[PDB]
Design a protein around this ligand. Structure first.
Ligand SMILES: Nc1nc2c(ncn2[C@@H]2O[C@H](COP(=O)(O)OP(=O)(O)OP(=O)(O)O)[C@@H](O)[C@H]2O)c(=O)[nH]1
Ligand SMILES: O=C(O)C(=O)CS(=O)(=O)O
Ligand SMILES: [Mn+2]
Ligand SMILES: [Mn+2]
Ligand code: NA
Length: 624
């Protein structure tokens, strides 16, 4: 880009560039970098190239500074331990800016929305001015050119993230396609402007905890969709700092998708092949920490079945001219929950994460390996464990060795069952969409929606136990429509109308919609279903239903499997009557709760067809 006009020497940052060239940048990229360098006052500017050399050097530097440790048991794996105040997303500090509050959330009858958080542009400018000026003093501003989707694919969307965190740079290299090639693909094109700071200018005004820079009191993750800007301050963690993922690929993208006729969803995409040599692709929306990654790379227990992974967390979809719903995964890696991961529950993940992987907030064994709750691998006598709090830890202690939201960040290309079509610009054709969450009571193992409009109601009605993925504590059952509650880019009522509208599209081949519950519990709080690989038994039923098999019985909530329709061979001890039971009293209460939630929270923007489905389900339940 060109040198800004100067009367002095205060606007051209060329002298502070320690890698790359402001002259080589597309004009608008340069204006974005330089304007924010003027504001944030970094000491240096490093334009990332995405090279192995760059990555190696940055890791070694974080190592020197004690920001990460090398895990010597594995090939090129690393461990970061965070300040305990910065361990997950914070939904209450995540906001979208629009002219009108109703463009961002429905206006709730109760006065507090549970479907996002809006802030006026005036208020945001005040918040911004209180945070960013001078915030990178003494630090390097890294400039990360990244593509969401394969390099140079016509359906890729490019962003530039400016950050003062090398941990964000390393993680973005895994989770996106990053570097010089992306600048070359971008040329003079438009890009999403992403600005991030950990919010700790040097010299440090506040103590540094665990070598992890963050500013919890001022944390704020903001989205300005008309300006095509994402602006995040104060957290270094995951969805708060890796701006291509939740902030761009769900919140900004879901709004663009509404405008342009596609969908951006909190969905895995998997391909499943049956023993008859037929393959179908399915998408599944489960809430944060409710099973997507474990389903997307499942090792099926049924013989003759194979699952392959296209993506585990975000799907971009659209109906093509032939009417097929085609999906792509915009990410380049998996940012997976670590606890619970074992050879038994997710062996494909175990294989993926043994090299080139960054782990955050897991425990470290004395021989340089990783540990967490549920890892299910005993250690040799003499091997000791350092918890994620950087303290010696024993199996008998009060607290977990790993944070409950600790994560691995691993290249998708390393997954042994990555799908051969995972980088195809044409996407893959989705034949079924699965909704579900954590429901310990009332909701059976699987059912099928009665129609498109009923299936959109089922997504809208989703509820699920809180998890550790954000700030919600305890196990309270929360609404999480479409697994998108933290992630809607715009008014949820309009999103429902957008989903409903797909029924009217030319030649549309609408996928079958299902709802599952892996998490139903008996009287003693034990799971009624073993899950993980055994979920292949439920996918088999869904496969047959997509093919038109007569394996369904009608109930008030939708179709369920006929007696004997599910393959339960090898699971003789499963209580089918309890797992599949539908109780009038439970469901009366459930439809009353959904009615009150939709009335309060969606109100004037609730599509008539969704209200109609609510009345229809209430009626079917009343006839029980
Ligand atoms: N009991 C049971 N637990 C499961 C099942 N699938 C996943 N889990 C556990 O639930 C947790 C979350 O699973 P993930 O697959 O990582 O969740 P996710 O939906 O990918 O979450 P995000 O990456 O946060 O969007 C892990 O601790 C898993 O071991 C299942 O079938 N049964
Ligand atoms: O919370 C989720 O759904 C995640 O996938 C993790 S984060 O990227 O939001 O940190
Ligand atoms: Mn997620
Ligand atoms: Mn996941
Ligand atoms: Na640390």
């Amino acid at each position: 880009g060109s040198m800004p006009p100067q009367l002095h020497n205060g606007l051209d940052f060329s002298a502070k560039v320690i890698q790359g060239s402001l002259d080589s940048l597309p004009q608008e990229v340069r204006k974005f970098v330089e304007g924010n360098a003027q504001l944030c006052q970094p000491e240096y500017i490093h334009i990332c190239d995405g090279s192995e050399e760059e990555y190696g050097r940055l890791l070694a530097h974080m190592q020197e500074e004690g920001v990460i440790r090398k895990l010597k048991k594995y090939d090129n794996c690393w461990l970061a331990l965070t300040d305990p105040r910065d361990v997950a997303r914070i939904e209450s500090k995540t906001v979208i800016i629009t002219q009108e509050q109703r463009d961002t959330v429905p206006i709730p009858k109760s006065g507090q929305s549970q479907l996002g958080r809006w802030m006026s542009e005036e208020d945001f400018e005040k918040a911004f001015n209180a945070r960013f000026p001078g915030c990178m003093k003494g630090r390097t501003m890294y400039v990360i050119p990244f593509s969401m989707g394969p390099l140079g694919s016509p359906l890729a969307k490019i962003g530039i993230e400016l950050t003062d965190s090398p941990y964000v740079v390393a993680s973005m290299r895994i989770m996106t396609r990053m570097g010089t090639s992306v600048l070359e693909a971008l040329g003079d094109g438009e890009f999403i402007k992403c600005l991030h700071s950990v919010g700790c200018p040097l010299p440090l005004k506040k103590p540094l905890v665990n070598n992890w820079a963050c500013n919890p009191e001022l944390t704020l993750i903001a989205h300005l969709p008309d300006r095509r800007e994402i602006i995040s301050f104060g957290s270094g963690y995951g969805g708060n700092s890796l701006l291509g993922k939740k902030c761009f690929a769900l919140r900004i993208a879901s709004r663009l998708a509404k405008e342009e006729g596609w969908l951006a969803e909190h969905m895995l995409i998997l391909g499943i092949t049956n023993p008859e040599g037929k393959k179908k692709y399915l998408a599944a929306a489960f809430p944060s920490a409710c099973g997507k990654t474990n389903l997307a790379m499942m090792n099926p227990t049924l013989p003759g079945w194979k699952v392959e992974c296209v993506g585990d967390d975000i799907a971009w979809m659209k109906f093509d001219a032939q009417g097929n719903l085609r999906a792509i995964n915009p990410e380049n890696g998996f940012f997976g929950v670590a606890p619970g991961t074992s050879v038994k529950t997710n062996p494909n993940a175990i294989k993926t994460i043994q090299k080139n992987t960054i782990f955050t907030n897991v425990a470290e064994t004395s021989d340089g390996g990783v540990y967490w709750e549920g890892i299910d691998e005993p250690l040799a006598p003499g091997v000791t464990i350092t918890s994620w709090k950087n303290k010696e830890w024993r199996p008998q202690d009060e607290e977990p060795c790993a944070h409950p939201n600790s994560r691995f960040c691993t290249p998708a290309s390393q997954c042994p069952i990555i799908d051969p079509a995972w980088e195809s610009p044409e996407g893959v054709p989705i034949e079924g969409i699965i909704f579900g969450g954590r429901r310990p009571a009332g909701v059976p193992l699987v059912y099928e929606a009665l129609s498109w409009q009923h299936g959109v109601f089922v997504g809208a009605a989703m509820r699920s136990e809180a998890t550790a993925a954000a700030e919600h504590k305890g196990k309270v059952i929360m609404h999480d429509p479409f697994a998108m509650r933290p992630f809607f880019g715009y008014n949820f009522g309009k999103y429902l109308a957008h989903w409903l509208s797909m029924a009217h599209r030319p030649a549309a081949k609408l996928p079958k919609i299902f709802h599952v519950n892996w998490f139903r519990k008996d009287k003693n709080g034990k799971f009624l279903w073993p899950g993980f690989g055994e979920n292949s038994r439920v996918l088999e039923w869904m496969f047959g239903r997509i093919e038109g098999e007569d394996s369904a019985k009608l109930t008030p909530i939708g179709y369920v499997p006929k007696e004997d329709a599910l393959n339960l061979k090898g699971l003789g001890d499963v209580n089918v009557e309890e797992l599949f039971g539908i109780s009038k009293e439970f469901w009366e209460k459930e439809v009353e709760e959904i009615d009150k939630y939709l009335e309060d929270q969606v109100n004037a923007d609730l599509p008539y067809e969704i209200e109609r489905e609510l009345r229809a389900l209430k009626q079917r339940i009343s006839q029980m």
